[PDB]
Write a structure and sequence with these properties.
The chain is mostly beta strands and about 20 residues long. The PDB classes it as rna binding protein/rna.
Length: about 20
RNA sequence: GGCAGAUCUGAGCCUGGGAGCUCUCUGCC
């Protein structure tokens, strides 16, 4: 799946297989 | 060169509730 992180008030995600 | 983590309280942009990219810091090879 995608790994999210809180950046710029919004949550940025990173494609991670699952 | 690659990977991971962090954020307007490290920083910026686009879309539009996320998904990408660059930069910075840290760590690893």
């Amino acid at each position: 799946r995608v790994r999210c992180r809180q950046r710029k008030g919004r949550r940025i995600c990173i494609r991670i297989x699952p």
